Design a binder for this molecule. Structure first.
Ligand code: HEM
Ligand code: HEM
Ligand SMILES: [C-]#N
Ligand SMILES: [C-]#N
Lengths: 127, 127
């Protein structure tokens, strides 16, 4: 359980978190207006691959997508405080669906602190 | 009293390590987009000078560049865990290419531990 990725249960956990997140996005009145496709399967795959690589897992994200330029990839979309908050709600819901044996208090806090900081940093629009 | 630098084979060892590192960088989906495409020779040379000096070799780095100030020198770049991990991956490959006669287990571990700690200290961005 060296890497954060391995410590929290690896592929199975990230699939669990991101699938639950994207299931929430699908119903989300705020986020549905911003995610461009009806079929959110691609978006879910890419976010999952990114998070898996970020926390020390497989490098499939950069193999398929190249270098992470996260600001430029969000630039087409108007992400104001309102979208940021909806994103964080869906993530908090997804993370709360994971049990504490799998995701212990320390790793849970660390992941949540990361997602909070990252989402604030991606706000790119006043409205 | 023998320096780490001389113990590990001095200039030839550091040249091999940094040269191989830069060759891995060029094949790395993450890092090839980060290092300066038009300044790779000079960049390779600065890293070699730095490492040679850090480990007790020539102090040419400080004469030419002053105090390392690595945080400020990496400030122009968004280094997240993604870039940290890619750097260490490339560095691990370069270091592994050096034989254990030249670079024995004790010196190998000390070099790797340094690179690990230093790469972590240069993380400056969430993505
Ligand atoms: C701040 C609230 C956010 C909103 C509203 C948002 C929305 C979006 C949208 C609409 C896309 C394009 C979806 C598509 O491909 O069809 C996208 C892509 C992406 N997002 Fe977010 N996002 C947010 C925050 C984040 C955060 C915090 C992260 C990771 C830390 C993240 C990681 C990614 C990644 C990796 C992609 C795909 C990049 C690629 O093209 O490879 N996003 N996001
Ligand atoms: C953490 C991941 C890292 C990334 C993405 C990264 C990337 C870069 C880049 C793009 C440059 C500019 C190259 C140039 O034009 O000189 C640079 C410079 C440099 N890096 Fe790194 N680096 C990382 C870690 C490290 C580490 C761990 C060390 C310590 C061994 C280091 C030592 C240096 C030195 C000495 C320079 C040149 C400074 C100068 O201009 O005098 N870097 N780095
Ligand atoms: C972004 N999801
Ligand atoms: C820095 N290389």
């Amino acid at each position: 359980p060296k890497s954060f990725y391995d410590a929290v249960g690896g592929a199975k956990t990230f699939d669990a978190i991101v699938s639950r997140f994207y299931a929430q996005v699908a119903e989300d009145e705020v986020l549905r207006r911003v995610y461009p496709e009806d079929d959110l399967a691609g978006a879910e795959e890419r976010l999952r691959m990114f998070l898996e690589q970020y926390w020390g897992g497989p490098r499939t994200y950069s193999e398929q997508r190249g270098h992470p330029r996260l600001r430029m990839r969000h630039a087409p979309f108007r992400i104001s405080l309102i979208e940021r908050d909806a994103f964080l709600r869906c993530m908090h819901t997804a993370v709360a669906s994971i049990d504490s044996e799998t995701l212990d208090d320390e790793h849970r806090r660390e992941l949540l602190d990361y997602l909070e900081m990252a989402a604030h940093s991606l706000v790119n629009s006043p409205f």
